Amino acid sequence: DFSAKVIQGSLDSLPQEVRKFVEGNAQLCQPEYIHICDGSEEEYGRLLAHMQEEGVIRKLKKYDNCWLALTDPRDVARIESKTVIITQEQRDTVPIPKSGQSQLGRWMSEEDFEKAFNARFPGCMKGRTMYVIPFSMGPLGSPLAKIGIELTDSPYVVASMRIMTRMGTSVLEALGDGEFIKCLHSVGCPLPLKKPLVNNWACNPELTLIAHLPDRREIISFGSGYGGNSLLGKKCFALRIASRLAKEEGWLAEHMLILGITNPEGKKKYLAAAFPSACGKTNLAMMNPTLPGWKVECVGDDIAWMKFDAQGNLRAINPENGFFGVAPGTSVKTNPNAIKTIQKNTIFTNVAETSDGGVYWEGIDEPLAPGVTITSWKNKEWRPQDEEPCAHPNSRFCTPASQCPIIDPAWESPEGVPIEGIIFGGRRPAGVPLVYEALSWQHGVFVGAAMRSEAGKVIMHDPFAMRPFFGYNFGKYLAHWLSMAHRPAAKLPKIFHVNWFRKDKNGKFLWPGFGENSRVLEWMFGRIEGEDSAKLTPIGYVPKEDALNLKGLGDVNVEELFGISKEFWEKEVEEIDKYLEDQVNADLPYEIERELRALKQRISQM
Ligand SMILES: O=C([O-])CC(=O)C(=O)O
Ligand SMILES: [Mn+2]
Ligand SMILES: [Mn+2]
Numbered sequence: 001d002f003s004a005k006v007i008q009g010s011l012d013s014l015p016q017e018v019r020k021f022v023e024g025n026a027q028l029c030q031p032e033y034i035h036i037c038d039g040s041e042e043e044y045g046r047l048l049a050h051m052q053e054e055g056v057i058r059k060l061k062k063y064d065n066c067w068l069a070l071t072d073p074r075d076v077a078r079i080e081s082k083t084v085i086i087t088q089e090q091r092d093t094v095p096i097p098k099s100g101q102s103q104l105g106r107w108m109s110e111e112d113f114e115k116a117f118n119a120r121f122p123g124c125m126k127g128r129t130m131y132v133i134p135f136s137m138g139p140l141g142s143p144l145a146k147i148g149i150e151l152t153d154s155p156y157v158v159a160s161m162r163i164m165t166r167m168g169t170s171v172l173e174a175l176g177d178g179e180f181i182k183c184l185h186s187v188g189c190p191l192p193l194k195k196p197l198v199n200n201w202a203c204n205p206e207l208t209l210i211a212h213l214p215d216r217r218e219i220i221s222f223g224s225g226y227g228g229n230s231l232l233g234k235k236c237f238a239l240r241i242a243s244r245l246a247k248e249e250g251w252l253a254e255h256m257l258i259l260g261i262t263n264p265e266g267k268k269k270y271l272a273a274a275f276p277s278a279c280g281k282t283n284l285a286m287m288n289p290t291l292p293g294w295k296v297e298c299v300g301d302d303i304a305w306m307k308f309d310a311q312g313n314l315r316a317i318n319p320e321n322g323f324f325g326v327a328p329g330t331s332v333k334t335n336p337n338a339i340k341t342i343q344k345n346t347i348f349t350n351v352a353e354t355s356d357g358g359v360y361w362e363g364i365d366e367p368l369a370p371g372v373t374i375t376s377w378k379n380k381e382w383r384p385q386d387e388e389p390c391a392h393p394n395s396r397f398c399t400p401a402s403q404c405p406i407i408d409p410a411w412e413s414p415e416g417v418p419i420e421g422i423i424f425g426g427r428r429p430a431g432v433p434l435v436y437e438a439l440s441w442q443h444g445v446f447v448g449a450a451m452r453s454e455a456g457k458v459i460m461h462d463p464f465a466m467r468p469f470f471g472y473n474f475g476k477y478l479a480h481w482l483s484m485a486h487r488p489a490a491k492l493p494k495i496f497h498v499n500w501f502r503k504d505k506n507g508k509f510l511w512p513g514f515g516e517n518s519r520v521l522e523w524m525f526g527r528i529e530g531e532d533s534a535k536l537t538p539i540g541y542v543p544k545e546d547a548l549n550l551k552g553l554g555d556v557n558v559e560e561l562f563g564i565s566k567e568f569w570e571k572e573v574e575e576i577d578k579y580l581e582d583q584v585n586a587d588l589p590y591e592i593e594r595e596l597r598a599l600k601q602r603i604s605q606m
């Protein structure tokens with residue numbers, strides 16, 4: 001009985017199964033205190049002030065309720081090589097590759113994980129508070145929402161979870177005796193500290209491991225206090241665990257932004273887009289369109305949960321409550337709406353700080369007044385012509401979604417928003433046109449499977465933008481997508497592929513992008529409407545001559561931007577073939593192989 005150790009809430013008021021989870025892990029982790037989060041404003045403020053006096057965070061004086069954390073440089077990102085999924089059979093988690101090692105996930109056996117767990121968790125919270133975070137992924141009342149309980153010894157995690165999820169007492173009362181995802185997190189630094197504390201950031205990189213056990217509905221993460229490793233609702237729950245629940249239950253959990261777009265005639269459509277991590281999801285989801293009479297509104301910028309309704313509509317919710325966006329490159333000109341969002345109630349991690357108490361990073365596009373000096377993310381004085389960047393490339397803001405000035409009015413509608421188009425995209429300097437449309441649902445699924453993007457001197461595969469996020473066998477995921485075509489009365493969205501990043505022969509971008517992407521969205525809008533605005537090519541439908549609105553853009557090189565080379569596409573289709581053969585092997589669905597053969601055939605005839 002850990003009752004004597006509860007500093008907020010009560011174990012007695014917890015639902016039976018939540019109490020067992022808390023007490024079981026309290027017995028194991030040996031926290032000094034247990035704090036059951038209520039999610040109140042007072043709880044939040046006090047928590048932040050406590051971190052401030054322990055040197056864990058700094059208050060940013062230029063803004064209203066904004067805070068800055070600087071991490072141990074060893075703990076700065078998601079670590080994929082220490083991220084694993086446990087199942088009885090490896091094949092259920094990752095396809096068995098024909099030649100090399102899997103790029104599509106990392107399986108660990110139940111036996112290996114048990115030994116790993118025992119080497120980490122016993123006593124790991126000694127001298128610390130165990131915070132119990134009840135949280136909902138999705139609008140509280142939504143039929144698409146799912147509830148988790150995260151246990152953590154990190155106040156940084158608590159504050160960030162309040163922003164990124166719906167957190168507190170109302171979630172407990174909603175849950176009742178329902179099922180929930182069990183989430184266990186520890187920074188892995190029991191007191192007294194065995195190893196030196198760096199930058200007042202507790203972490204254990206040597207023993208970092210983030211595990212998912214879908215059959216047990218558990219996420220177990222040790223050693224990192226950073227972002228995707230510690231905010232368990234984010235990637236662990238919302239993509240990895242969720243993609244498996246979705247497989248089982250007949251819906252989709254995707255690495256997709258969701259936006260709502262209205263034309264000058266009052267017609268509104270919702271679109272979802274999947275681009276690889278750090279490519280421009282927030283930019284597209286929050287764009288200010290340049291075309292008059294058009295408006296874009298943000299539903300979400302990272303994760304989409306989608307389920308066909310009884311009427312056959314693909315209904316989507318954003319399961320998150322905030323934005324955890326990459327800070328560097330965010331500017332007034334690139335993303336003015338994000339700037340307006342992050343002005344208050346925001347937590348920044350690993351960014352620079354100005355002497356005025358403001359935030360700074362690479363590509364912020366804000367000249368500073370004479371006198372104003374800069375402190376880097378490493379807590380040292382910084383100059384514009386210095387060797388190092390002032391902010392870590394993977395630095396973050398964590399901001400409430402409700403603060404977005406163009407947040408969609410249905411962004412927390414329990415029923416979700418009807419998706420009418422799905423967009424795939426990557427960074428391709430060559431060969432791939434600005435936009436094309438898939439020939440069918442099956443071709444569209446293939447397009448998602450074939451996604452590649454530059455990372456800059458290597459082009460690598462990132463199918464569906466989900467490569468680090470598949471909760472199960474990618475071949476089975478493909479089968480799951482294809483099965484939607486056989487669901488009665490399903491209204492299948494149009495599938496597009498975009499490339500903002502095509503260059504000419506001397507390295508210059510061919511497309512202005514940003515707000516000008518509204519022009520591409522307009523074309524998709526009309527195609528969804530049935531507009532006769534498309535021309536057939538071997539790779540899919542492209543805009544007809546003059547079909548794109550290019551007014552106000554000057555002389556855009558449409559020949560190069562929309563050019564398709566037989567030579568390029570021969571190589572491309574060859575590359576996709578070898579990749580799918582190797583990485584998907586026996587679990588590659590017939591239809592994907594068929595789409596591949598068809599594409600090869602169309603290319604051979606040009
Ligand atoms: O890892 C995270 O939580 C941030 C993110 O959205 C991504 O890099 O895909
Ligand atoms: Mn993401
Ligand atoms: Mn079929």
Ligand code: NA
Binds near residue numbers: 200
């Ligand atoms: Na710090």
